[PDB]
Amino acid sequence: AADYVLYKDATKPVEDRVADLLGRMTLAEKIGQMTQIERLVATPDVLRDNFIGSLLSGGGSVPRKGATAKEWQDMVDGFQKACMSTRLGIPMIYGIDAVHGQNNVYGATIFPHNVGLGATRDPYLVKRIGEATALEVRATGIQYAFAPCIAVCRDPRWGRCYESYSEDRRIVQSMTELIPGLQGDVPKDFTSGMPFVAGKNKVAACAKHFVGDGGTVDGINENNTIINREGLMNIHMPAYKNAMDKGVSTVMISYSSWNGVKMHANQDLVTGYLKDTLKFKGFVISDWEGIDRITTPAGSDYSYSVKASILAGLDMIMVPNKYQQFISILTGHVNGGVIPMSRIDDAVTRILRVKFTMGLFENPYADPAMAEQLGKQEHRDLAREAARKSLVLLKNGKTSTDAPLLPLPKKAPKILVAGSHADNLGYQCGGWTIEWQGDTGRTTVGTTILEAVKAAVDPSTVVVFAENPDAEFVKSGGFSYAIVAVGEHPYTETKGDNLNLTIPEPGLSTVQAVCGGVRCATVLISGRPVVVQPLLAASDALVAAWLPGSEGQGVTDALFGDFGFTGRLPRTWFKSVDQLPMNVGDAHYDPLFRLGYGLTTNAT
Numbered sequence: 167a168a169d170y171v172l173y174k175d176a177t178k179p180v181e182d183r184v185a186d187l188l189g190r191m192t193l194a195e196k197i198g199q200m201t202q203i204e205r206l207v208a209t210p211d212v213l214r215d216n217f218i219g220s221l222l223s224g225g226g227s228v229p230r231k232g233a234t235a236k237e238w239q240d241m242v243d244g245f246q247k248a249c250m251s252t253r254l255g256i257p258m259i260y261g262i263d264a265v266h267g268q269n270n271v272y273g274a275t276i277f278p279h280n281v282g283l284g285a286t287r288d289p290y291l292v293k294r295i296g297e298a299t300a301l302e303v304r305a306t307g308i309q310y311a312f313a314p315c316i317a318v319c320r321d322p323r324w325g326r327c328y329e330s331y332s333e334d335r336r337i338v339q340s341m342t343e344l345i346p347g348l349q350g351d352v353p354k355d356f357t358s359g360m361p362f363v364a365g366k367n368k369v370a371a372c373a374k375h376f377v378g379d380g381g382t383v384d385g386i387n388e389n390n391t392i393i394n395r396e397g398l399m400n401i402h403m404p405a406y407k408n409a410m411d412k413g414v415s416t417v418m419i420s421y422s423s424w425n426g427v428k429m430h431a432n433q434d435l436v437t438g439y440l441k442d443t444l445k446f447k448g449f450v451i452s453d454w455e456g457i458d459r460i461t462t463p464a465g466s467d468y469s470y471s472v473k474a475s476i477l478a479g480l481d482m483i484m485v486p487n488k489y490q491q492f493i494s495i496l497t498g499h500v501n502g503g504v505i506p507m508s509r510i511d512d513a514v515t516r517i518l519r520v521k522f523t524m525g526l527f528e529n530p531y532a533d534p535a536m537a538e539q540l541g542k543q544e545h546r547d548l549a550r551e552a553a554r555k556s557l558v559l560l561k562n563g564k565t566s567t568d569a570p571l572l573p574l575p576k577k578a579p580k581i582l583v584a585g586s587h588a589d590n591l592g593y594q595c596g597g598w599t600i601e602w603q604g605d606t607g608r609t610t611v612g613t614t615i616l617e618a619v620k621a622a623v624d625p626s627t628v629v630v631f632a633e634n635p636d637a638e639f640v641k642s643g644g645f646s647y648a649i650v651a652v653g654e655h656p657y658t659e660t661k662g663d664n665l666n667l668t669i670p671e672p673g674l675s676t677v678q679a680v681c682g683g684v685r686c687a688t689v690l691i692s693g694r695p696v697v698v699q700p701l702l703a704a705s706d707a708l709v710a711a712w713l714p715g716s717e718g719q720g721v722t723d724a725l726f727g728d729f730g731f732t733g734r735l736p737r738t739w740f741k742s743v744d745q746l747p748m749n750v751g752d753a754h755y756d757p758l759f760r761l762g763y764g765l766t767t768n769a770t
């Protein structure tokens with residue numbers, strides 16, 4: 167046609183489309199592509215006027231409580247209509263933390279957190295979870311998931327240990343299969359470091375947080391990782407190469423420092439290593455107010471934050487609120503020659519490369535036929551499989567000569583289900599579920615451990631629930647056995663940092679009351695190893711269930727012997743927090759349970 171514009175031609179090669187569009191852009195259009203804002207500060211005028219490149223939902227940033235998939239699609243499409251109305255019509259990309267399913271959304275399947283996935287040693291399971299997650303994210307109109315976290319947690323006092331598959335880099339490397347699940351498999355020909363997304367039923371992925379987020383002193387979140395280059399490259403870096411080989415579209419930078427250098431200011435690692443050595447050609451995104459946190463106190467020199475980060479090689483800044491100040495400062499740095507146009511053009515080349523590659527110019531709007539993928543039963547069946555595979559049986563009898571307690575019989579006259587975590591969907595999902603920090607009670611659609619027991623047992627079995635029964639209640643109750651579930655409360659990021667790793671009361675006291683009256687199976691809900699000798703001493707059987715998500719029937723599938731226990735510890739279980747850090751090759755390696763430990767059962 168006479169009004170032909172090459173970048174708008176879907177038959178043209180991505181690199182030609184990128185260069186064609188880049189060549190038309192003004193500095194304001196270029197800096198707008200580099201800007202990611204919260205939906206909370208977005209309006210149609212803001213998105214058009216500042217040529218915004220991306221939006222996100224932070225944890226709990228939702229159009230309303232209980233919103234349907236269509237409500238999400240209508241919100242995202244509203245923002246997109248504004249972006250498509252700009253002079254160049256560059257669609258925005260919408261990101262979200264879909265880190266164990268599409269976890270901010272009511273009715274989304276919630277998969278086990280990464281630590282329990284590590285326990286499965288099943289990369290294909292994790293790929294299938296990426297596939298199901300992409301469908302439930304696209305059900306809501308969202309095109310970009312901030313996952314996987316390929317942190318290698320080296321100290322369980324870290325609040326984000328549950329977001330790491332393992333302390334063993336080799337397990338983390340294996341679980342990079344989430345990437346082709348979320349994005350699609352890369353073709354035969356594929357060049358390591360290029361971005362890839364198969365099309366409108368897949369999402370852009372994000373390898374995070376580059377690099378050494380799991381290596382910080384005493385597990386302090388966002389703090390310093392003190393390790394020589396050989397150890398950074400041997401432990402923290404390897405899974406990023408697997409991510410490049412699988413075509414991960416984006417990389418998010420860590421709040422943490424390496425030997426005192428902020429990652430958000432580290433040109434040698436972000437440009438010298440990730441871009442120039444690993445040949446990454448997708449886009450690099452900040453963390454949330456990550457450039458503000460380059461300084462002490464955070465946000466005390468935002469002009470320096472902007473200069474340091476953009477010169478380090480970051481492409482897109484998760485501002486996410488003060489966009490006027492970000493755009494203004496960056497524009498002033500370019501106008502002043504402090505940041506060269508070559509750097510702006512690289513950042514925009516990478517952002518557009520991802521957008522064109524993933525088909526976002528061809529399919530900028532949501533597909534209403536995808537809405538019904540949210541919470542689909544096949545995905546729940548997958549989450550139930552994953553939860554069951556994640557369980558690690560730590561004890562199954564007090565002595566070598568006792569009858570094994572597990573598997574339990576489905577037919578018994580009366581059984582007890584007890585503990586703070588037995589009937590609390592929010593607790594079994596943990597952080598990053600509906601709210602940022604997670605929450606308590608019936609926050610979404612799912613099955614608690616109590617509901618799963620009631621669904622599993624013979625009709626003649628009477629199930630009694632008591633959250634915190636006393637010893638006499640148990641001894642007088644006529645119970646065959648008890649299932650008692652206790653553990654950690656939900657947490658995220660620095661709220662989770664914990665130097666004592668002792669579960670909250672009344673958990674141990676409830677286990678001791680229950681188990682002292684009747685044979686008991688203790689189900690421990692945690693993001694990590696926690697002080698466990700007292701729980702073990704009380705219990706006939708004890709299962710580390712991690713944070714198994716919405717499908718509590720995965721727990722009962724192994725308790726009642728439909729399947730055998732197969733999970734193995736993906737991290738060391740410490741005897742004492744004074745040991746830490748303590749990893750599977752140090753001089754003082756003296757675990758309660760070594761990495762890889764796990765008892766088994768046979769299906770009944």
Ligand SMILES: CO[C@@H]1O[C@H](CO)[C@@H](O)[C@H](O)[C@H]1S[C@@H]1O[C@H](CO)[C@@H](O)[C@H](O)[C@H]1O
Pocket residue numbers: 223224225226227454455487602659
């Ligand atoms: C209400 O959330 C908080 O908003 C203020 C400013 O209005 C920010 O400065 C805070 O950092 C966030 S806290 C928390 O941050 C998460 C990322 O670390 C994000 O995913 C979540 O939405 C926020 O609640």
Ligand SMILES: *[C@@H]1O[C@H](CO)[C@@H](O)[C@H](O)[C@H]1NC(C)=O
Pocket residue numbers: 386388389390423426462
């Ligand atoms: C580590 O945390 C300490 C104590 O909160 C803080 O003062 C220091 O700046 C932090 N270091 C880094 C690199 O973040």
Ligand SMILES: *[C@@H]1O[C@H](CO)[C@@H](O)[C@H](O)[C@H]1NC(C)=O
Pocket residue numbers: 662663664665666667668
């Ligand atoms: C353990 O640490 C957490 C916070 O890090 C705290 O809330 C809890 O009370 C501590 N428990 C004990 C017994 O010190």
Ligand SMILES: *[C@@H]1O[C@H](CO)[C@@H](O)[C@H](O)[C@H]1NC(C)=O
Pocket residue numbers: 767768
């Ligand atoms: C479970 O299966 C294997 C046989 O393949 C056996 O060696 C193991 O001891 C069995 N344990 C049981 C049935 O309790």
